[PDB]
Amino acid sequence: SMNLERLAENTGEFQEVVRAFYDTLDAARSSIRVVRVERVSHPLLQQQYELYRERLLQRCERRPVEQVLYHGTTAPAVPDICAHGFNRSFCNATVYGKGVYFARRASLSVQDRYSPPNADGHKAVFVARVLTGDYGQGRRGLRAPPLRGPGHVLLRYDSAVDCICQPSIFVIFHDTQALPTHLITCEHV
Numbered sequence: 179s180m181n182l183e184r185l186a187e188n189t190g191e192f193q194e195v196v197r198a199f200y201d202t203l204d205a206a207r208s209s210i211r212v213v214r215v216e217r218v219s220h221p222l223l224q225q226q227y228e229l230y231r232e233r234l235l236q237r238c239e240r241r242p243v244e245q246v247l248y249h250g251t252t253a254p255a256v257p258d259i260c261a262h263g264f265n266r267s268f269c270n271a272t273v274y275g276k277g278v279y280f281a282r283r284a285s286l287s288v289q290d291r292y293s294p295p296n297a298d299g300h301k302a303v304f305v306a307r308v309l310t311g312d313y314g315q316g317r318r319g320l321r322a323p324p325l326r327g328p329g330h331v332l333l334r335y336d337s338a339v340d341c342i343c344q345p346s347i348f349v350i351f352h353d354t355q356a357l358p359t360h361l362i363t364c365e366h367v
């Protein structure tokens with residue numbers, strides 16, 4: 179909470195982020211209000227992230243290798259994420275693996291079970307760049323992405339998902355594979 183910077187409502191960056199948030203808010207597009215949007219700066223994690231991104235850009239089948247995704251969290255977790263990035267050791271049921279869950283659609287992250295509100299009724303949703311790369315099928319046992327199986331050089335997939343077909347959830351298992359960029363503070367009207 180020391181490397182957060184509030185964005186004014188009348189700026190390009192605030193509008194990009196908020197528009198993308200409302201576009202994917204579905205069910206609750208008209209119940210949810212935005213209180214605040216803050217830029218997250220973590221120069222070190224960003225460098226560690228860019229190095230991983232270079233390795234994936236050089237060798238992934240799927241495109242894109244990188245996606246913007248939402249992570250709802252508890253008020254107490256906000257300082258840690260801003261200081262350290264996403265920490266899978268805080269693992270709700272780990273249905274698709276013991277990793278950090280990101281959602282394609284904000285509708286999912288903004289639910290009270292993922293972003294529970296605090297005493298002021300404020301809900302914490304992070305926007306993150308995530309190196310999804312080549313994803314495999316998640317399942318509850320997974321302490322890492324699932325094995326690629328025989329005849330692949332790479333031992334494991336980059337991430338795990340609910341469903342390979344149209345995936346809506348990504349589970350990532352490396353501290354450097356997800357960079358928080360913005361903290362959206364929202365509430366139910």
Ligand SMILES: O=c1[nH][nH]c(=O)c2cc(OCc3cccc(Cl)c3)ccc12
Nearest residue numbers: 248249250270279281286287292340347
């Ligand atoms: O935005 C989130 N922040 N934190 C979470 O733990 C989290 C978890 C999450 O899926 C859990 C789940 C449960 C049943 C079926 C599916 Cl497919 C997925 C989705 C989003 C989030």
